[PDB]
Design an enzyme around this catalytic site. Structure first.
Site, PDB file in Angstrom:
ATOM      1  N   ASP A   8      60.853  96.190  54.141  1.00 57.26           N
ATOM      2  CA  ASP A   8      60.784  96.865  52.864  1.00 57.26           C
ATOM      3  C   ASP A   8      59.983  98.164  52.965  1.00 57.26           C
ATOM      4  O   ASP A   8      58.753  98.137  52.939  1.00 57.26           O
ATOM      5  CB  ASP A   8      60.163  95.910  51.839  1.00 57.26           C
ATOM      6  CG  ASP A   8      60.053  96.511  50.457  1.00 57.26           C
ATOM      7  OD1 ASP A   8      60.643  97.583  50.213  1.00 57.26           O
ATOM      8  OD2 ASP A   8      59.374  95.891  49.606  1.00 57.26           O
ATOM      9  N   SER A  11      65.918 115.056  47.455  1.00 55.42           N
ATOM     10  CA  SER A  11      67.317 115.292  47.749  1.00 55.42           C
ATOM     11  C   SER A  11      67.728 116.616  47.134  1.00 55.42           C
ATOM     12  O   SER A  11      67.189 117.032  46.112  1.00 55.42           O
ATOM     13  CB  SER A  11      68.189 114.156  47.212  1.00 55.42           C
ATOM     14  OG  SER A  11      69.565 114.466  47.362  1.00 55.42           O
TER      15      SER A  11
END
Ligand SMILES: Fc1ccc(-c2cn3ccnc3nn2)cc1F
Ligand SMILES: Fc1ccc(-c2cn3ccnc3nn2)cc1F
Length: 330
Positions: free
Chosen positions: A35, A199
């Site tokens: 994770d 992004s």
């Protein structure tokens, strides 16, 4: 040193991925959820409330000759999806795919929430976010990666998640045969303890690329792709009959649909998520309504590039003094 371990989806929809981890002496192999969105290595154990264990493999520290109780240390973690667990702490030898760390804090669960109990395939979590998020008290503990970093050939690990197929976690080296083209690296902010990056935009299907900054985290521990509601609405607008269902808890679409791809930007580069990656199957057994793999981050408070996005890429988690993320197509 290096390590290389296969990571395997827990079911036919890639709802999560498990990676075998050796703990203790002799080794006790548990299948952990790697994770990058958390920083605690915790396991079902001989200490876990018996009624909260249902099929999981447990760690028994009393059977490990290298296990040592970390005196006074406790841990308690709550995840974004509402799940939680808590317990005490041992240090022990932990190996992943041939890479060994001694004195790793292994957090033993005394309590787990129902979602963990009901997941017979996940024996625990291995956190790979930054150690600043580690919940051990009163002495915060380091992640497996942090402990291993100095010994690695290169202070990196890579995530290569498969679509409906096994993939790979590598530590300490970049497998140049595992991706196509080049790796595009992008800046990381560690200020929130995550692999947080920006992004450069998105496209829906064969649509025009929209240049827009989307700050988010690369999180292997989250199944779906969570993005701003504007972005998500533009995606599902291209799927006939798709709608946001308050009762189901997100966007659903007709199972008969052919889903468009979704492209996200990494610098000037582009990662394309095939439409099939975005189908998480019927909302209930037998239903013709399917659950979408792209959902709104509104109300989470952060955008999350989870498995739906990451599995479309070869992802480098560069843990150098100034951390960065790398993305390549594959
Ligand atoms: F649409 C979804 C599908 C599966 C999961 C999901 C998350 N998990 C974390 C550990 N085990 C898990 N199983 N399942 C979440 C979704 F939002
Ligand atoms: F359905 C959900 C899926 C993921 C998150 C969630 C929030 N996070 C913050 C940092 N890491 C995180 N991981 N996960 C919340 C959801 F409600």
């Amino acid at each position: 040193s290096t390590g290389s371990a296969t990571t395997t989806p827990i079911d036919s929809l890639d709802d999560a991925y498990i990676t075998p981890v050796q703990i203790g002496t002799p080794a006790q192999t548990l299948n952990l959820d790697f994770d990058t969105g958390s920083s605690d290595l915790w396991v079902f154990s001989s200490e876990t409330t018996a009624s909260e264990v249902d099929g999981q493999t447990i760690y028994t520290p009393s059977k490990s000759t290298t296990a040592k109780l970390l005196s006074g240390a406790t841990w308690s973690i709550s995840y974004g999806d509402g799940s939680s667990s808590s317990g005490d702490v041992y240090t022990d030898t932990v190996s992943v795919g041939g890479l060994t760390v001694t004195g790793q804090a292994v957090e033993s669960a005394k309590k787990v929430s129902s979602s963990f109990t009901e997941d017979s395939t996940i024996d625990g979590l291995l956190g790979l976010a930054f150690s600043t998020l580690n919940t051990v008290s009163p002495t915060q503990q380091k992640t497996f990666f942090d402990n291993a970093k100095a010994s690695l050939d290169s202070p990196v690990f890579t995530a290569d998640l498969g679509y409906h197929a096994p993939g790979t976690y590598n530590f300490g080296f970049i497998d140049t045969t595992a991706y196509t083209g080049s790796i595009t690296y992008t800046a990381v902010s560690t200020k929130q303890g995550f692999w947080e990056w920006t992004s450069t935009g998105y496209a829906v299907g064969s649509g025009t690329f929209k240049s827009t900054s989307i700050d988010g985290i690369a999180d292997t521990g989250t199944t779906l792709l969570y993005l701003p509601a504007t972005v998500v609405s533009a995606y599902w607008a291209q799927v006939s009959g798709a709608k946001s269902s308050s009762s189901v808890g997100g966007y659903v679409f007709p199972c008969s649909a052919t889903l468009p791809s979704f492209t996200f930007g990494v610098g000037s580069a582009r990662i394309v998520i095939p439409g099939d990656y975005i189908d998480f199957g019927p909302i209930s057994t037998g239903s013709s309504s399917c659950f979408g793999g792209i959902q709104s981050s509104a109300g989470i408070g952060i955008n999350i590039f989870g498995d739906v996005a990451l599995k479309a890429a070869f992802v480098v988690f560069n843990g150098a003094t100034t951390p960065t993320l790398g993305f390549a197509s594959k």
